[PDB]
């Protein structure tokens, strides 16, 4: 109560009173309140925020920005503020001392301001000293001080010119200059600072601009707008991305995690999340602080809505009050944005961090530890674990903070409902509870549906695969139309099944979208019809509607989160058990590979004992020997003796039970197995070392790689290893030994590398390198093998068995012993419809509009004697409108099912395209399998997506246009604001959709290489460990993962920037829809304004939903554009049209005609044939033998006539080919396939494409055709449906069945289409024997590649250089060396 004695002696100026600040038409605060509270507000904030900010800043020194003029002017500004504010105290002291009583308020309020501003000046000076450009705290303090000063200024100006007011002329000017200069300070302190003296960017020219940006720029994400503008027009690729800010690269992040883990495990456990609780933990506190405020804003919204509605209901409140209601709400919304989307970012970045952390751990753990203990699968348990666990750590970061936030909201919301609608809203809660099962039930119901259908879908796909193989090697015949007709029939059956599936799914999802409407319907009905005296009002109704809208989301989000937590916990165990698998083996057991550079003995050992594992008996025991320096030693044992075990033991990869071991010098290891990194041969041989000439040529020639270099297409520049050319095993060991010797080591160790090398080459390599004649004779060389030729010439041989060295000595002494070596030599070795859908969508949307309008008309019914006139008709018509909604939604669900039927007719058009590609001239020299295989299947699979794609997009667009029209039909004046907002939205959406597509491709591009490198390192871990060069490989992995991380960062930033820039549109439209409604309160019912303002929030959320889904799914629109682009391969020249139907007079003789042939290869090449004119008379035969594929294919193509034949006529037997039926003659000539192929499908139908032939004659021919082995190969034989062109078992019996088919068609003239060329010898003999025995009554144009049976010809002609030459007398043609004989000679004479 001291304030009453503080403001004045009499206490005639009290505090807050509604009679002066709330109930009047001219609001204004009282004197002492302005004197104390308003000026006390900002100082408390500054004094509270000072110490924490100082403490945080005391750990992040970054620069020494010295003398920028902005700091000087700001400091002078603060000092001159302080001097005047203390001059005020001096003034007041003068008057109070003159004996004038002064209110104690004036000696307390101004004095603290000087101290506060001096502290602010000291803070800005320290800020300059520590060197940070943008200040995120000064802006808020200046802003709040300015707001308080503006309020005081409004009060003072209002009390100034009221009527001859008497004011002291000292405080007015002082306060005016104070406020104005605070304004100038605020506007001046917002631009920037210049730069720190020394910066991190000393060499890199492309850093992230985020490091240096203003506070407003960081809040609004401004730089990425410029990045997107740059990337829009030209493609965004390559190094255009920025570099990391050196807090995200693993080089300085992984070390902290790994050292903390090592400390904890040595202390050892609480899993790695508990470690991050002290490492990554201190980066979550803000992520928890922000969420509470973000939550409180949404619930603060509808309360303001209800207050505004209540104010609108009144008709006597002062008008200005309404403005105070509308200015606040907008501001609140803005703040909500600036705390939500800024939150996600930080959370997201932390998630990104954790990922790279584990990338540094597992690799570093896998490379150096757990030897012989890795018993899990080499693939599927490490790389699979790596990838899956790394990728499953992104969602949990997003969903971790929701676990407490998700239910809280719900509960609070429920309370508000129970506060507003009353306990009958607990029955409304029962209604929402009955809404939450059906949804889940629908979900679960939907679940089972697809899986059954997926099984059905699974069925279809395997069938499709078979069909594709059917056309992989197909060349002729028209069975394709028929079995694809069967395929489309079964596809249509599956499509009726999918019609029922789409029925179910569509009704589920779209009645789910309608579910909020009907749950609001049911809640409203049950509330209004229960008991009496409960009259619906716009306030309660619309608060309930808004709360239902805001509550629908978290309930649906709640599932899939607990499952995510469960799966994360499951995944955690594997990583924990793998990381806690330390059992650190290779600390030290040796005297290290090199400790002294000189000595007499290189390898010594005594009493050594080794075993594979502690659970196994010792495989090696009692090992004791000494090996001198630079000696030739060979260790010998039986197969399975244990030579490799001791060999690895000397490499220090074994378990030493006991024994003293000593080794000197650097070492090089050659295992029997070899692993090759995917790189160039040059780089693979180098393995880090630079080129050394002529030492490079020296080692290449010693390796004798010159033939190997020249046979390879690119010499020593082509890719080696996987993902390309394959090498031979012997060449693999040659490459391994080449890189080993090029390494120029001290000790060389070999595990029978010459196992796959030729003995001649083996001895040459022996005398070139490893043997005494080699240049490396001055080093120590150890090799283990079981060779017999090279043992005599080596220095010393030591033989072991049973885990112990049986004997030692040189070759001469061992041979003289006549013992173990002698027995080794003795017993071994040597001595329309679319318009309907549009109409239905229009009907649905206009019906929803009418329902809302009728709700508006209901809510404003005047109350009479307790009730509102009539309500039965209102409920009846409202339910009728809901039934209309249901009918409309079912109608357009049936419409999208008929859209699936449209997709079915599009698949009919696609199979028309399949029969379109029957011409195959382009198919010959173009890639065939992969393109069509992926093409057809992927298009057909995602073609079922597009009915879902077009539907929801159309729905959302109609929803947003309906929202626009309904906000329009409320106030005709507010129409002046929509076009600019629409234009801004269109530009933003176009830029984002054109930018994000290129960015999201780089992630898929760069995901694979890190996994590939990890697998590559794991496969050859032993060798790289043996080479002692591990820093390079881990550095390479670090660089690769950093490169992959480089492109991932700027994607989530753009995703956040979209929402940040888009929520402002919603905020502005809400604010203007309210403001244009308040001004005309006198002529508006509560219902109209209620609907209009309530629509604003759902307009915002519908716009967000539309942009996000139908832009990432307008990205799916881009995907279907890509689908059409893929399906844009048509317009082929060849075609089968125009026919000749003359009388048939064929075959009896076989007269042949050739004239003016210019036959040749691809158009740009030369003429293989040049105007050949040979009229082969009837009875005279011509054996066209030459090179391979010269003219036989040309004759076959001329006989194929499948292409357009507007011209071309050849006279045969005196009756033209045009005078013979085209299809009749082309399928009448018996074409025996070059590659023997049995037809696909049922064999009986295979041999009866038309089924117009008697089976008895077929069986007679088959009895004459003893060649039916592949017929027996098929299980069901004649009734066996075949696939892949009947290519299952051996090819000779395929030729047998092909001859059986030739005798089945049984035409007097058969053209031997290179069947005898691509066959072996014995089958050739058998087929030629049966050709005589049966076809001695046939006209044979025998074309044979092998002269074993050619001598039975008539007149052979050589087409030397593709030109007809000497005819007849085959022996003479052998004497004149024809071209056919030329290719016969070309095949390896020596």
Swiss-Prot record:
What does the entry list as the binding residues for ATP 1? Answer: 612, 637-644, 672
Q: Which residues are glycosylated?
A: 19, 23, 865
The UniProt note on how this protein's activity is regulated states: MK 571 inhibits sphingosine 1-phosphate and leukotriene C4 export.
* Extracellular compartment spans: 1-33, 96-100, 155-172, 297-322, 421-423, 528-549, 848-884, 970, 1084-1085
Principal localization?
membrane
Q: Which cysteine residues pair off into disulfide bonds?
A: none
List membrane-spanning regions: 34-54, 75-95, 101-121, 134-154, 173-193, 276-296, 323-343, 400-420, 424-444, 507-527, 550-570, 832-847, 885-905, 949-969, 971-991, 1063-1083, 1086-1106
Which segments constitute the ABC transporter domain?
A: 603-827, 1152-1386
Question: Ranges for the ABC transmembrane type-1 domain?
Answer: 284-567, 834-1115
Q: Name one GO molecular function term.
A: ATPase-coupled lipid transmembrane transporter activity
Q: Give the enzyme's main class according to its UniProt record, as a single word.
A: translocase
Positions carrying N6-succinyllysine are 462
What is the reported tissue distribution?
Lung, testis and peripheral blood mononuclear cells.
How the protein assembles, per its UniProt entry?
Answer: (Microbial infection) Interacts with human cytomegalovirus protein UL138; this interaction mediates MRP1 degradation via the lysosome.
Name under which the protein is recorded = Multidrug resistance-associated protein 1
Q: Gene encoding this chain?
A: ABCC1
